[PDB]
């Protein structure tokens, strides 16, 4: 996975070096951001059906044309697909946010989906609206700590910023 | 290469589950240990050179037949191979001490070693007593219990980290048999 | 030569999209000559020109002068790998030792990233290296549109891992071909002469020998985990690895025997399932955010882990029962490689075993 | 009620003879199980049969 | 079926069958070619009772079709014709043996802790026999729809 | 039957001792545990229908069982299949919250073999029925409950087998 | 790579002799089809991606178990190169289809393929299943009896054809198990 | 067996079907090895004698070939031979001429499953079948050995 210690490991390798003070330093700034991405972690196993709930059913108020058949949504089976292609990008997102980085969230998630959404007929201006609508409905101090949140925005964003 | 995080983080994918606070409790600890892994790896690879040299050396006086004519270990070239085989060995492990899972170890030098030293007839017991003399060398440094050299860190415990050290070096010990 | 040559080559040559579906990912990088002070490319380039082996200093002094001119950035990073291919440790180590078949296969391994494709190919080579000797086919490999449409001025070559591969035996001999990551090319026979004469896939076990490692795979290569035997023993396992794969083969033809029966006579209600006019709650028009689950109740996360999950009727239950028997089939399918792989590995020590010479001569 | 007409251990060896082994041989292939339910099925009869 | 009942009857009784019993029973197997003919036109004809009868079940009925509901979807659907095809079938049984034990035997005996342990509401499943019984009646004559929809009357007063 | 505590005054009992130190490490276990199966007893208690009908839709239903020919093929058979989980579930409550399976011997695996051998009732179906109910049951009452629940869940699968 | 004519050529030098007119007259009948496959390599090759997604769709719908986390169907990657395989696939079956024979389809893809597959875990049966899927699709449009298009072509015979790309089709379903 | 396959039932095949080859062959060539072993006072002499000599021959080969299917002699051994040689002693039944009548059951054997008995030829694609010869000489001599 692309994180810090394996990006410094990585290098380290590539080059042929031993660790010096660089990689050190930079796993000492793995080990004091992890607090707080791991908190929002915590938050994020904590209330995730109710994150794809809101997230999916402010996708159909927003698009209500996929609801008519022939559109990718029609069947029980394809609107509780949307709801677990979601709960999917959810998970992926709580993954990359414990690792630390983009490595484990776009080597799933990111890599190939070009293929597959142009393919099957996949908006993903609807999975924008459903990010968009967790990213706007999220909060400053209510549900979480402020900096930490700033992490799982950086996180959202990112899928956003690699989706369209 | 996954690291704690990421073998955290796949078995949470295999198991297609969010990872959750068990999970994030042992990881809070892999923190909060932190700057004893980091202290513990600039230890070793500090005096790096010198326990290669040092084991390679013990791993020739153990069996003179190495640096016997026909031995592995007889040319220049081939003690200097030697050396930097030992040398590589002991960076991966580091790698794997930085990293606290062992897919570095066994995804970019145990994939292919066996087989490696097989096709060129390197005698592979004494590569695992080789990778024995590196442990315990290693675990003096990481213990600060060397015979030359015992520089000042803040004192603790750090027993669970030396485990791990050994558990590494078993693993490429067991690993090249 | 002049004959027909069948095939695209390599086809990465237009369009560098399927990079990013393939084992590529796990690939570290490419070096990439961008900005100065290089420092890098040397290093990988050195990798792979050579077959991990080990150079010292006094022989690194050989192809010094191709060196100075490349630090200084005088010269391509294609003429520096051409001037290292010219120099006599690329001789010594690939060409003096090491009889022809090897070295041409060698040849394909280092400079254009890829195994043979065909006799075709390769006959063509003996043609060029008889007609005009080792610096005459060195220009041919360094020479060829492919590595000037693929590899480009700036990056060092790396082993491809286009999409496609058109000859799919390509594949398993680039595999096969490469090694491991810790895999030094010495003292090593022909290993794809077999394959490129009449062509058959080369092994099972080996193809993954030569692959970069997936994190996630569905089944962990149980490497490391096999028990210490003598050979008889991991062949009598595998025997039995065979003996269960035939029993679980078997059972998965059952599984979508009684799938058919069950869908062929169910698919008459699933016909008048598409006569219907059939009309929502609000389903024909009605924009006012209708409730998607009005079954759920505070944990449920109904859709499931799948989305087929938690949905089942006449013909949806037989299909999980099918995929449990896949994935069992799958499981054992992955034994007989690593058992395979035990049985080569130690056949191989049978063959050679190491012997240190015990008295020194003081 | 089930009458069973069940032959012996010693009976299955009596299968080797060439005509015997040509009939039931390629029922030692192990794909074959439907094919012996349906021998063995001929050897159950329902209700009671037996001697007077 | 009729005589066995009959049968059952006089046995426990442990007396021969009645005189009257026996009259019956003539009147049945003369009754019995008509009774044929009713249930191989149901037989062939029960595609268009069971599509029919499901599109007047739907068309009344929009709950269970409904997203939320208990036949919600393409395969849920298929299944609740199934088992309108079931009753259908079972009905034909009723009819060539003079009786509704099977009909009771097969499909009624313990029908409502089924459907209870479905989730399926049980009054949808009658609207959907009589539906089918109004498709069944539209096929056949004045007195033989009569016969045959008291049949599906069994069924209906069974479900409720 | 038995509890825990009653089959320690057995054994304490038939050697005509008194309680000793080793006993009374055995009711400190029971009584360290029994809050924990008080609780997997209501949670069971409270989703006993709906533990029922998730593992015969995971189990049983869409078949050959189901299908004409198998055995739950009416809607007699389906009712006496699911009646007889339903005692499945309550005993295997009783052996939980107990301590002790010498329920499930005494009152339900007496004659319950001779009875399905005699009927026909297929004895895998059954095992794997219960099996489901083990995974549901786990599911709702977690890991240790669940761990609890198995022992006796298997308890009836090792009887029918 | 060789098509109908190569193939009556080396099978004519097999016997080291003239071709002659018996052969020549059925390469007149083989030329005098023409148009025919001509229209019908147009027919698939049309609708080929619509082919490919509905086929890999109903594949993962017949076994759940490619969904789920674990099999490698699940993640965007091996979604995409599933995609592309099964368009590799009714790539070469089309190449197949213009050719007249199935020589470019023997050596490209079945001659190594399920090795591949083998080394990679990808499971074989799913992949009858998908070529199935892609066989009947594929006739369903060859013979234009497709339900959701329809266009219009002057009517005749093309059921040998059909007969053809069913044959193609079987040959890479029972190379891939 | 995964790899013997086609390969064991195919010389299960060929032994099995050449019985009556391989039985009056080896009892014909026991008669013509002794006179004394045809004369009177012989077991064979007896019509009724013979024609159990005969259904031991076949009793024999079809326990031995048996064994070929199931890999090791435990069924020959339950029933074939378990109680054997009393018998042959407690009914005056020599047992030289029995030891040289396997011994010949044993060499028609692997001449016909490598098939170098000149006179059957049917064709089998050609493979190493060496260690299946040795274990079938081995049951051979396992009975021969049990007889004396
Ligand atoms: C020293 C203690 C040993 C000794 C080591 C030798 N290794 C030789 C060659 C060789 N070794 C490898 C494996 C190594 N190279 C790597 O880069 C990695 C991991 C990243 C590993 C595990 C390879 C691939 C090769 C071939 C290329 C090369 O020559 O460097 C070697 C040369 C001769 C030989 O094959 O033995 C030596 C001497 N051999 C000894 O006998 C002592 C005990
Ligand atoms: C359901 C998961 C399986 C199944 C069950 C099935 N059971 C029966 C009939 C009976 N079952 C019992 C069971 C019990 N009696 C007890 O005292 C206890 C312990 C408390 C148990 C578990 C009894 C007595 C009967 C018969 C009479 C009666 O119930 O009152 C049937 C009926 C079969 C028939 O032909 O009659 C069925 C079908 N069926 C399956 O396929 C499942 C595996
Ligand atoms: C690891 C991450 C990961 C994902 C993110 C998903 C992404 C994804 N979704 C689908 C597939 C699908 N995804 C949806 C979802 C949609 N329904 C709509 O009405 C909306 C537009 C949208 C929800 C917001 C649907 C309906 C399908 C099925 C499409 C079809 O078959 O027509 C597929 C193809 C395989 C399949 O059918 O399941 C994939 C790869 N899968 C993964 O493995
Ligand atoms: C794990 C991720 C995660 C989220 C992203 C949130 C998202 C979220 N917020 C609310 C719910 C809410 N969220 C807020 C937050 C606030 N509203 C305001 O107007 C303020 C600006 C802002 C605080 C800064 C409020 C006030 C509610 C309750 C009422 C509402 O919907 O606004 C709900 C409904 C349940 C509830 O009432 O708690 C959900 C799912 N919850 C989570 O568990
Ligand atoms: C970039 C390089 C780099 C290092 C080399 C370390 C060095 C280092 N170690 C500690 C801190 C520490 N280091 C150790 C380690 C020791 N335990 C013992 O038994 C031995 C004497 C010794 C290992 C050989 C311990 C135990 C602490 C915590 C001390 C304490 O809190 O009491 C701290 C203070 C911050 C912290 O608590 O983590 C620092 C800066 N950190 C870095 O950033
Ligand atoms: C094949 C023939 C051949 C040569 C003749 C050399 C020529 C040469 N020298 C340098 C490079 C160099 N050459 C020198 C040498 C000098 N130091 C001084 O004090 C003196 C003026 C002078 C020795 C008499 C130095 C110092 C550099 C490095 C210059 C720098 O980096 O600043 C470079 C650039 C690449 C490099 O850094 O090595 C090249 C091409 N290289 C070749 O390949
Ligand atoms: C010229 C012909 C030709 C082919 C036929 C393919 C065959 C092929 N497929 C893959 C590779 C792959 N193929 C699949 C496909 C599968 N996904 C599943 O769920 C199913 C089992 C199966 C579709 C039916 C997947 C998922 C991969 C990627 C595997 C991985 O990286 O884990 C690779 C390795 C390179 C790559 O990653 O693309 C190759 C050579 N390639 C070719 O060049
Ligand atoms: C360069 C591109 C190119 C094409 C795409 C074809 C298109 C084409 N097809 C036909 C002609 C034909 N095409 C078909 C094909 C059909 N048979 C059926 O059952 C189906 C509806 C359909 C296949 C899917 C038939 C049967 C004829 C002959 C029609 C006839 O003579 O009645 C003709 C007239 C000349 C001839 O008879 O061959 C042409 C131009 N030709 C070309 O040059
Ligand atoms: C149901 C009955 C039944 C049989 C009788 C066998 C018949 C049989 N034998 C082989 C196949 C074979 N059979 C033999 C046998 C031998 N070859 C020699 O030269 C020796 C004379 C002889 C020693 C026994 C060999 C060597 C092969 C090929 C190697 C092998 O398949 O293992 C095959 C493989 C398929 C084929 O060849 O077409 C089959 C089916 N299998 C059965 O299922
Ligand atoms: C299951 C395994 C099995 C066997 C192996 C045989 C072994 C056997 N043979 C005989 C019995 C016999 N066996 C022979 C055979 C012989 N005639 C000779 O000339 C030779 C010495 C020898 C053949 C090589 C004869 C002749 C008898 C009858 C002896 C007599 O009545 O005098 C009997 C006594 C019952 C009977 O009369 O049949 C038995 C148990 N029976 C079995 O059930
Ligand atoms: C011969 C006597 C007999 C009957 C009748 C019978 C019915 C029966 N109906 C079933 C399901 C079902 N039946 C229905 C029926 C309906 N849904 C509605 O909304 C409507 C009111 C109704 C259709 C008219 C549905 C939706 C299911 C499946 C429900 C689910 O699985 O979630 C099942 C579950 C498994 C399976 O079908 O294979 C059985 C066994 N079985 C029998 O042996
Ligand atoms: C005669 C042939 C010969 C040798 C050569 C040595 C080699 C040697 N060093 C060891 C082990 C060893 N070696 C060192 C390193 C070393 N010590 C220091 O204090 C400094 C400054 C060092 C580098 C200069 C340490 C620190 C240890 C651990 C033991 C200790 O505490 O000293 C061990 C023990 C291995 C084990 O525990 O399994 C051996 C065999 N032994 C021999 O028989
Ligand atoms: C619920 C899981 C599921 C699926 C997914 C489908 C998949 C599917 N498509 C088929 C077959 C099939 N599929 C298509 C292609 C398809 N139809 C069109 O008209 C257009 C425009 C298409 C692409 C968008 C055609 C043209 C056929 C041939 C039948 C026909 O005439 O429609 C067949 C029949 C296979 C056979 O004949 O052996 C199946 C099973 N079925 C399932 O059960
Ligand atoms: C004159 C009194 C007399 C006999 C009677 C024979 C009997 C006889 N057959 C033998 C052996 C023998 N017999 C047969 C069977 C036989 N051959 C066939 O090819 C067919 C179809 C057969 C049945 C019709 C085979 C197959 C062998 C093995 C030798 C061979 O390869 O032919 C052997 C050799 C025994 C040994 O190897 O120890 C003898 C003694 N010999 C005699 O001296």
Same mark, same amino acid.
């Given at each position: ?82 709801? =677990? ?60 700590? /402020? ?8 996180? %959202? ?5 690699? %989706?369209? | ?75 220049? +070239? ?100 | ?44 380039? %050195? ?20 060196? /100075? ?14 001037? @290292? ?88 001999? !680039? ?12 003292? +090593? ?45 991991? =062949? ?22 009684? +799938? ?15 006569? !219907? ?86 | ?44 009869? $329902? ?6 | ?33 008509? $009774? ?13 009772? @069971? ?58 005996? *313990? ?50 | !039957? ?36 008080? +609780? ?83 004895? *895998? ?15 709702? @009452? ?20």
């Amino acid at each position: 996975m692309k994180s810090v210690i394996t990006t410094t490991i990585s290098a380290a390798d590539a080059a042929g070096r031993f660790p010096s003070s660089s990689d050190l330093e930079s796993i000492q700034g793995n080990i004091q951001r992890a607090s707080a991405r791991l908190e929002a972690a915590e938050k994020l196993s904590g209330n995730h059906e109710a994150v794809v709930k809101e997230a999916g059913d402010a996708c159909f108020a927003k698009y209500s044309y996929l609801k008519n058949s022939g559109e990718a949504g029609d069947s029980q089976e394809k609107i509780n697909k949307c709801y =677990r292609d979601v709960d999917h990008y959810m998970r992926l997102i709580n993954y990359s946010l414990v690792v630390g980085g983009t490595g484990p969230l776009d080597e799933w998630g990111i890599a190939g989906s070009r293929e597959v959404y142009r393919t099957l007929n996949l908006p993903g201006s609807a999975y924008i609206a459903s990010f968009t609508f967790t990213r706007d409905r999220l909060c400053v101090p209510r549900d979480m700590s /402020s900096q930490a949140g700033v992490e799982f925005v950086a996180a %959202l964003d990112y899928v956003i910023n690699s %989706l369209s | 290469m996954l690291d704690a995080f990421s073998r955290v983080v796949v078995n949470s994918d295999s198991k297609a589950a969010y990872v959750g606070g068990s999970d994030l409790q042992s990881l809070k600890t892999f923190i909060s240990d932190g700057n004893k892994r980091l202290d513990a790896v600039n230890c070793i690879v500090s005096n790096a050179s010198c326990i290669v040299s040092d084991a390679i050396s013990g791993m020739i006086c153990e069996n003179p037949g190495l640096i016997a004519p026909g031995g592995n270990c007889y040319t220049n +070239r081939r003690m200097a191979a030697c050396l930097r085989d030992g040398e590589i060995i002991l960076r991966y492990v580091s790698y794997a001490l930085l990293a606290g899972d062992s897919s570095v170890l066994d995804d970019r030098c145990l994939n292919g070693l066996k087989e490696t030293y097989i096709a060129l007839g390197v005698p592979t017991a004494s590569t695992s007593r080789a990778v024995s003399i590196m442990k315990a060398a290693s675990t003096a440094f990481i213990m600060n219990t060397a015979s030359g050299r015992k520089i000042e860190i803040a004192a603790g415990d750090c027993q669970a980290l030396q485990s791990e050290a050994a558990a590494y070096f078993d693993k490429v010990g067991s690993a090249v048999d | 030569a002049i004959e027909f040559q069948t095939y695209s080559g390599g086809l990465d040559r237009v369009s560098l999209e399927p990079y990013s579906i393939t084992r590529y990912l796990f690939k570290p990088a490419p070096a990439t000559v961008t900005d100065g002070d290089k420092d890098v490319a040397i290093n990988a380039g %050195l990798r792979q020109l050579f077959g991990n082996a080990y150079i010292m200093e006094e022989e690194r002094a050989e192809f010094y002068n191709a060196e /100075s001119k490349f630090r200084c950035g005088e010269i391509t990073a294609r003429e520096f790998a051409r001037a @290292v291919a010219l120099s006599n440790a690329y001789r010594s180590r690939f060409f003096n030792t090491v009889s022809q078949y090897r070295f041409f296969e060698l040849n394909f391994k280092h400079f254009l990233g890829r195994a043979p494709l065909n006799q075709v190919e390769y006959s063509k080579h003996f043609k060029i290296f008889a007609e005009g000797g080792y610096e005459a086919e060195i220009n041919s490999y360094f020479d060829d549109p492919e590595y000037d449409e693929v590899f480009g001025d700036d990056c060092m070559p790396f082993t491809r891992f286009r999409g496609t591969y058109a000859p799919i035996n390509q594949f398993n001999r !680039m595999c096969v071909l490469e090694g491991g990551f810790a895999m030094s090319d010495k003292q +090593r026979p022909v290993q794809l002469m077999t394959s490129l004469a009449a062509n058959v896939p080369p092994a099972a076990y080996r193809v993954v020998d030569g692959l970069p490692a997936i994190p996630n795979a569905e089944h962990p290569t149980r490497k490391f985990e096999l028990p210490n035997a003598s050979l008889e023993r991991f =062949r009598n396992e595998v025997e039995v690895a065979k003996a269960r794969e035939l029993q679980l083969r078997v059972e998965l033809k059952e599984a979508y025997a009684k +799938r058919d029966e069950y869908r062929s006579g169910f698919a008459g209600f699933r016909a008048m399932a598409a006569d !219907m006019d059939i009309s929502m709650l609000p389903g024909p028009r009605f924009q006012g955010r209708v409730e998607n689950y009005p079954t759920w109740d505070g944990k449920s996360a109904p859709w499931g882990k799948s989305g087929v999950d938690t949905l089942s009727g006449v013909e949806k239950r037989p299909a999980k029962e099918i995929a449990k028997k896949e994935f069992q089939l799958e499981r054992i399918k992955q034994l007989v490689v690593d058992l395979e792989r035990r049985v080569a590995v130690l056949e191989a020590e049978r063959e050679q075993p190491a012997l240190t010479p015990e008295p020194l001569m003081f | 009620p089930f009458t069973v007409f069940a032959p012996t251990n010693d009976a299955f060896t009596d299968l080797l003879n060439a005509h015997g082994f040509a009939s039931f041989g390629p029922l030692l292939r192990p794909g074959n199980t439907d094919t012996l339910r349906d021998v063995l099925l001929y050897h159950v009869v $329902r209700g009671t049969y037996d001697a007077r | 079926s009729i005589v066995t009942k009959s049968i059952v009857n006089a046995d426990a009784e442990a007396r021969y069958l009645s005189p009257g019993e026996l009259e019956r029973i003539k009147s049945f197997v003369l009754s019995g070619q008509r $009774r044929l003919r009713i249930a191989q036109t149901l037989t062939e004809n029960r595609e268009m009772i @069971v599509k029919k009868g499901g599109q007047q079940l739907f068309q009344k009925r929009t709950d269970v079709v409904s997203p939320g509901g208990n036949a919600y979807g393409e395969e849920m659907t298929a299944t609740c014709l199934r088992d309108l095809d079931y009753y259908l079938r079972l009905v034909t049984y009723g009819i060539v043996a003079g009786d509704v034990t099977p009909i009771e035997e097969i499909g009624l005996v *313990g029908v409502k802790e089924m459907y209870n342990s479905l989730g399926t509401p049980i009054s949808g499943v009658s609207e959907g026999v009589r539906c089918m019984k109004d498709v069944a009646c539209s096929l056949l004559s004045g007195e033989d729809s009569a016969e045959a929809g008291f049949y599906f009357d069994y069924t209906l007063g069974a479900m409720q | !039957m038995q509890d825990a505590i009653t089959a320690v005054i057995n054994t304490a009992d038939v050697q005509g001792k008194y309680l000793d130190d080793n006993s009374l490490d055995k009711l400190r276990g029971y009584f360290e545990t029994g809050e924990l199966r008080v +609780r997997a007893a209501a949670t069971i208690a409270a989703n006993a229908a709906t533990i029922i009908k998730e593992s015969v839709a995971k189990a049983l239903l869409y078949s050959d069982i189901t299908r004409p020919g198998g055995n739950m093929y009416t809607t007699r058979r389906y009712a006496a299949c699911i009646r007889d989980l339903d005692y499945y579930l309550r005993y295997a409550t009783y052996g939980m919250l107990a301590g002790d399976p010498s329920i499930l011997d005494e009152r339900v695996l007496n004659g319950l073999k001779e009875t399905y051998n005699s009927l026909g009732v297929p004895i *895998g179906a059954t095992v794997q029925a219960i099996q489901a109910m083990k995974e549901v049951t786990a599911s709702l @009452v977690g890991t240790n409950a669940g761990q609890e629940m198995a022992v006796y869940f298997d308890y009836i699968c090792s009887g029918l087998s």
